[PDB]
Amino acid sequence: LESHMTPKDDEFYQQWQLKYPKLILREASSVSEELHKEVQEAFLTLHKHGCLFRDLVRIQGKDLLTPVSRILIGNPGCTYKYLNTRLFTVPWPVKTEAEIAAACETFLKLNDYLQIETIQALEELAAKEDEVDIKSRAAYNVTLLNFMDPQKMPYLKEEPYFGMGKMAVSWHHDENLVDRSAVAVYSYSCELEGRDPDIWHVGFKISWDIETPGLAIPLHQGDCYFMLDDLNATHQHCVLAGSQPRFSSTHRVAECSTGTLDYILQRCQLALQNVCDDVDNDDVSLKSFEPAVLKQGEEIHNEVEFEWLRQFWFQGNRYRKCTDWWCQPMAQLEALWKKMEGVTNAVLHEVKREGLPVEQRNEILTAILASLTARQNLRREWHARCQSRIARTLPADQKPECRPYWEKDDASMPLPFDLTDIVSELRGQLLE
Ligand SMILES: CC1(C)C[C@@](C)(c2cc(Cl)c(O)cc2O)Oc2cc(O)c(Cl)cc21
Numbered sequence: 001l002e003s004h005m006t007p008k009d010d011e012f013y014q015q016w017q018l019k020y021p022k023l024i025l026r027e028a029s030s031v032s033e034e035l036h037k038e039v040q041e042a043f044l045t046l047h048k049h050g051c052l053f054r055d056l057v058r059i060q061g062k063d064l065l066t067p068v069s070r071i072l073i074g075n076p077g078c079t080y081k082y083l084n085t086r087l088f089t090v091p092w093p094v095k096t097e098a099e100i101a102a103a104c105e106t107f108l109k110l111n112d113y114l115q116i117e118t119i120q121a122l123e124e125l126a127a128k129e130d131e132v133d134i135k136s137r138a139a140y141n142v143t144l145l146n147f148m149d150p151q152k153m154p155y156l157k158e159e160p161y162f163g164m165g166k167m168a169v170s171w172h173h174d175e176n177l178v179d180r181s182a183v184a185v186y187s188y189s190c191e192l193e194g195r196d197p198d199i200w201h202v203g204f205k206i207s208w209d210i211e212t213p214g215l216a217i218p219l220h221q222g223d224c225y226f227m228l229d230d231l232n233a234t235h236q237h238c239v240l241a242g243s244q245p246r247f248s249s250t251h252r253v254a255e256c257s258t259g260t261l262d263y264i265l266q267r268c269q270l271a272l273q274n275v276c277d278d279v280d281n282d283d284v285s286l287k288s289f290e291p292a293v294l295k296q297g298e299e300i301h302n303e304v305e306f307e308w309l310r311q312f313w314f315q316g317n318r319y320r321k322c323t324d325w326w327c328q329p330m331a332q333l334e335a336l337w338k339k340m341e342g343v344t345n346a347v348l349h350e351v352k353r354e355g356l357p358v359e360q361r362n363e364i365l366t367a368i369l370a371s372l373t374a375r376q377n378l379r380r381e382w383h384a385r386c387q388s389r390i391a392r393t394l395p396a397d398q399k400p401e402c403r404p405y406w407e408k409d410d411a412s413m414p415l416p417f418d419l420t421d422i423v424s425e426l427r428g429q430l431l432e
């Protein structure tokens with residue numbers, strides 16, 4: 001028999017107390033009516049503007065459209081990878097259309113509240129037994145807003161292990177967050193035996209384990225729960241659907257290191273340091289052909305192409321919908337990437353040079369081969385996603401573009417989109 005515990009069960013309380021002291025529930029009544037009102041109409045304002053989208057992700061070779069629709073809000077220039085998809089933040093105001101702007105400021109306000117609340121709970125957790133690590137682990141820099149109308153799903157998956165009923169989101173961890181960082185969730189739903197099917201819950205279980213009954217926490221309008229310290233790492237959680245639509249705001253400390261606009265612009269500039277930068281034209285000449293430098297260049301070339309450009313454009317107009325913040329950055333990154341395409345072309349030219357000693361030539365190939373191989377394989381992978389049957393089902397404002405894509409016989413680009421011949425020839429030379 002698959003069982004779980006809820007507040008109806010005598011044992012729930014001791015189970016929570018003893019086995020989940022890093023899980024906190026602050027009920028709606030602990031949060032002012034003022035914040036509740038401001039936050040709930042911010043959700044509606046964003047929903048009404050169509051700012052939340054389902055994502056067409058890629059998982060285990062499978063293109064899947066997420067049941068839940070979402071928008072990422074947070075520090076300007078920050079991003080968050082979620083199921084191999086890089087989400088780009090709609091900026092909130094610290095250091096557009098008035099309404100959407102206002103909403104973002106609201107979610108920042110909520111962020112401030114939750115943050116303080118989290119530090120407090122971390123400090124009490126510490127009192128049950130530096131301060132820098134506490135503030136570091138509650139410094140939320142993004143929220144991922146989620147929405148689902150359980151009515152639009154024709155059939156929801158049964159919870160596999162504990163008989164928890166229908167799932168909106170099955171078991172997982174929140175990934176790519178700062179080590180041991182808290183996660184804080186504001187939950188907003190409208191309105192014998194086991195959990196009430198009509199009510200939203202969050203479910204928790206320990207990783208690896210389906211023998212300890214899972215916990216299902218009911219979540220009524222405006223309840224907040226917090227996952228503290230290592231909880232998110234040691235436990236899985238899921239979201240159990242009720243009968244009515246529900247939003248949530250999930251505040252996180254995203255690991256914002258190789259995932260910011262400042263970082264990737266810096267990487268680009270680093271690559272371009274190998275380029276004679278007098279004038280911007282098709283005559284790209286390189287300062288050095290030292291293995292280590294050419295490798296770095298080609299790696300950055302792949303980084304901006306696949307982690308940034310292709311991720312951003314995969315979503316169609318999913319970002320210009322509610323902000324134009326990323327317009328100039330993406331135009332600038334693409335112009336940066338286009339120069340780097342000139343860089344690969346010049347490298348290929350150097351390699352082909354008849355005066356080049358074979359030893360130096362081979363040392364260059366060994367430097368760049370893995371990068372160009374990855375670039376080939378990754379392109380094939382991306383082009384396929386853009387052409388999948390599920391991708392073509394999407395609406396016009398969402399349908400994936402495979403930007404940047406060029407047909408060949410497009411004299412504007414120095415190299416072909418399809419690198420298989422070039423790769424095969426490079427690899428063939430190194431076997432001479
Ligand atoms: C991958 C899988 C099947 C499992 C699960 C539980 C999931 C979510 C997240 Cl966020 C995670 O980091 C890891 C996970 O296993 O939930 C979703 C939700 C979705 O919308 C889609 Cl398309 C796929 C999935």
Ligand SMILES: O=C(O)CCC(=O)C(=O)O
Pocket residue numbers: 068146169185187202238239248250
């Ligand atoms: O909505 C919640 O309570 C958790 C968030 C979540 O599971 C998600 O959509 O990633």
Ligand SMILES: [Fe+2]
Pocket residue numbers: 173174250
């Ligand atoms: Fe989650």
